[PDB]
């Protein structure tokens, strides 16, 4: 009773002293700093490839560290693995569940994992002495649908689950080395650093925050947004990442500064953005939309520049490849494009 | 450069039976339909199943299989994971007519379900699961539903209404007055794209299945119809 | 951050008013709809009231239709719900929820059990 108010308070008083603290050290904006650097131009990307072997919506796909395989998976139950140089097709892996909604590629290349609204998260060996494709491993710890997984090692994958939770598994023995806890609404997406000591989680409340996957503590919170939390990604650096939200913007947080750098927002968008993606040198942020087409921001000047176009359907997956040479763009009509 | 040119051999030859591999699940996969099956807690969808994270099950009626499904495994927040069902041939919405304190929230699922961005175009078949108890509890009077829906006192029955010869006109008054209030939410705002299918439904009902073919192919002809700009 | 305030009052007789206050910021008002829940004691989550982005689309549920009012002013960023006529029934507490995406005529998953974009609550008691 009057102690949960009390405690209620002293958040607050906490929280006030936090903001108070984030905004004296706002000494200028990156907009008022960025006014003595010149604008990219118009970036006019082209459609190079396009892959057509999927009967139903793509809803994720993930690019190879040797930046010419990749994987996508679609909710007809299907897992191809592309060659994007030849256009050609190494795998086609039926999964057990059809409502997939996440993919992931190993960095060694050799396994490959999924999972939906199955609950499991299901990896594939692809180099098996008999040359086939089967399943290695099934990892059951999470209640509630599985929104995304990424490799760490060979055996270390990380796990996001649409129930407040993301999980560090231990593929070999199967079973959760450790649990993440904090958020508030469904978590939606994560990204690790390039060095993999921390990642970041992007949720259903508005909220992002950064995990330190060897401590398993909540390390930092960022609260900038308005609406759901659909899509988060590095900076190529690993000391800044970029969120998008179904409130029609994107926003750029500084793990360092504690605040947000810049607000990649237009008046003529009222559409969530789906996915997010950086360039190599980490100038060109891509991020698909609701209104059936993706946009290109300079990571700078938040100005628009360069729109691809061509997708009959919302865009829902975007990935720049290892070497930043070109960006598969995958979308609800069954059509994954490739652009350089 | 022959050991490349093997390479590239071995790789379209991979290529060429993966597609074929993929026709043939083509073959498969276009010649089923997908129900997203949901309701409440008291709705009993459970029931007309008549056979995780999701709870599947295939059926077969006149050489069609139907591929219908449950999801129970997830939380209550469900704006989310509903999305990736945009794509169904229809949304099988169970409810109990029975608990008047529990159907304003199925009216508020059913209207956000139908005003949808991706759920815009998809059909909703609608089943009343607990006729039976509806009409018992009518038959008892202890409850009244002017005490829910101020508007049910000044409500008469549709003329285009079919009792059953045999029952009670005050349950036939209640029954598509609950009918209405769906169908009323339905038309508001539907511009001819999508469809809802209200059915009255018991829980020893053996043509549970009859209807939702009909339901469907009803659909998916309607949907021809206007692609071919001939509605 | 997004934060709703609740402000109403404490024990009123049956029969009498009562005003509630429901201060939004962190975002965009007008943009959003907003819906008015109550949670009675040993009771779940239900719906009473919603108004659209500009308030030309008012809804009210049936139990409380001809009795409450729901109201919007977008320009000091605040919602409001005057109460008439009590009943011992209305006592509960009472949460100003948001809606989770703007720009959209359906407002979904919102008496949820867990639920982000809500607020504290205030609590409506009537008795004698």
């Known amino acids: 009773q009057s102690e949960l108010d009390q405690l209620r308070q002293e958040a607050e008083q906490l929280k006030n002293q936090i903001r108070d603290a984030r905004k004296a050290c706002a000494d200028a904006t990156l907009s008022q700093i960025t006014n003595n650097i010149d604008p990219v131009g118009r970036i006019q990307m082209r459609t190079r490839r396009t892959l057509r072997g999927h009967l139903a919506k793509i809803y994720a796909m993930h690019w190879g560290t040797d930046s010419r395989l990749l994987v996508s998976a679609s909710q007809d139950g299907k897992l191809i693995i592309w060659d994007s140089y030849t256009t050609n097709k190494v795998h086609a892996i039926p999964l057990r569940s059809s409502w997939v909604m996440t993919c992931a590629y190993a960095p060694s290349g050799n396994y490959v994992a999924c999972g939906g609204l199955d609950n499991i998260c299901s990896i594939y060996n692809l180099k098996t002495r008999e040359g086939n494709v089967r399943v290695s491993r099934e990892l059951a710890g999470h209640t509630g649908y599985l929104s995304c997984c990424r490799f760490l090692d060979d055996n270390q994958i990380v796990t996001s689950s649409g129930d407040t939770t993301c999980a560090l598994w231990d593929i070999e023995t199967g079973q959760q080395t450790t649990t993440f806890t904090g958020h508030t609404g469904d978590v939606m997406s994560l990204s690790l650093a390039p060095d993999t000591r921390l990642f970041v989680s992007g949720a259903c409340d508005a909220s992002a925050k950064l995990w330190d996957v060897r401590e398993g503590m909540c390390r930092q919170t960022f609260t900038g947004h308005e609406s759901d939390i659909n899509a988060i990604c590095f900076f190529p650096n690993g000391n800044a990442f970029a969120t998008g939200s179904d409130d029609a913007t994107c926003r750029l947080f500084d793990l360092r500064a504690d605040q947000e750098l810049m607000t990649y927002s237009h008046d003529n968008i009222i559409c969530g953005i789906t996915s997010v993606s950086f360039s190599k040198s980490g100038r060109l942020l891509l991020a698909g939309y609701d209104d059936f087409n993706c946009n290109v921001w300079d990571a700078l000047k938040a100005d628009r520049a360069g729109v691809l176009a061509g997708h009959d359907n919302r865009v829902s997956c975007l990935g720049v490849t290892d070497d930043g040479m070109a960006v598969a763009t995958g979308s609800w009509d069954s059509f994954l494009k490739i652009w350089n | 450069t022959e050991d490349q040119r093997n390479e590239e051999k071995a790789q379209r030859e991979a290529n060429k039976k993966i597609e074929k591999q993929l026709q043939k699940d083509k073959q498969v996969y276009r010649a089923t339909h997908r129900l997203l099956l949901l309701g409440a807690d008291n709705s009993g969808k459970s029931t007309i199943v008549k056979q995780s994270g999701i709870f599947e099950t295939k059926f077969q009626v006149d050489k069609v299989n139907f591929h219908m499904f449950d999801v129970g495994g997830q939380r209550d927040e469900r704006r989310k994971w509903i999305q990736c069902f945009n794509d169904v041939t229809a949304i099988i919405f169970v409810v109990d007519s029975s608990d008047y304190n529990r159907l304003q929230e199925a009216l508020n699922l059913f209207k956000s379900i139908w005003n949808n961005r991706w759920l815009r175009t998809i059909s909703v078949i609608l089943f009343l699961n607990k006729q039976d108890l509806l009409a018992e509890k009518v038959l008892a009077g202890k409850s009244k539903i002017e005490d829910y829906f101020p508007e049910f006192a000044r409500y008469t029955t549709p003329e285009d209404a079919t009792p059953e010869p045999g029952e009670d006109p005050r349950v036939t008054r209640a029954k598509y007055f609950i009918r209405d209030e769906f169908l009323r939410i339905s038309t508001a705002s539907g511009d001819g794209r999508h469809y809802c299918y209200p059915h009255f439904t018991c829980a020893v009902d053996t043509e549970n299945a009859r209807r939702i073919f009909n339901d469907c192919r009803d659909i998916i002809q309607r949907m021809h119809l206007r692609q071919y700009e001939l509605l | 951050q997004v934060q709703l305030q609740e402000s109403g009052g404490g024990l009123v007789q049956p029969g009498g008013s009562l005003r509630l206050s429901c201060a939004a910021s962190?975002?965009?008002?007008?943009?959003?709809?907003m819906n008015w829940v109550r949670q009675a004691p040993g009771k779940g989550l239900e719906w009473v009231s919603d108004?659209?982005?500009?308030?030309?689309?008012?809804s009210y549920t049936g139990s409380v239709k001809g009795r409450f009012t729901i109201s919007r002013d977008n320009a000091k960023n605040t919602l409001y719900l005057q109460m008439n006529s009590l009943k011992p029934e209305d006592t509960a507490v009472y949460y100003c929820?948001?809606?989770?995406?703007?720009?959209?005529?359906?407002?979904?998953?919102?008496?949820?059990?867990?639920?982000?974009?809500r607020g504290q609550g205030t609590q409506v008691t009537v008795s004698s």
């Open positions: 108004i659209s982005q500009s308030g030309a689309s008012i």
């Open positions: 962190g975002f965009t008002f007008s943009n959003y709809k």
């Open positions: 929820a948001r809606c989770p995406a703007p720009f959209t005529r359906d407002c979904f998953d919102v008496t949820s059990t867990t639920y982000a974009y």
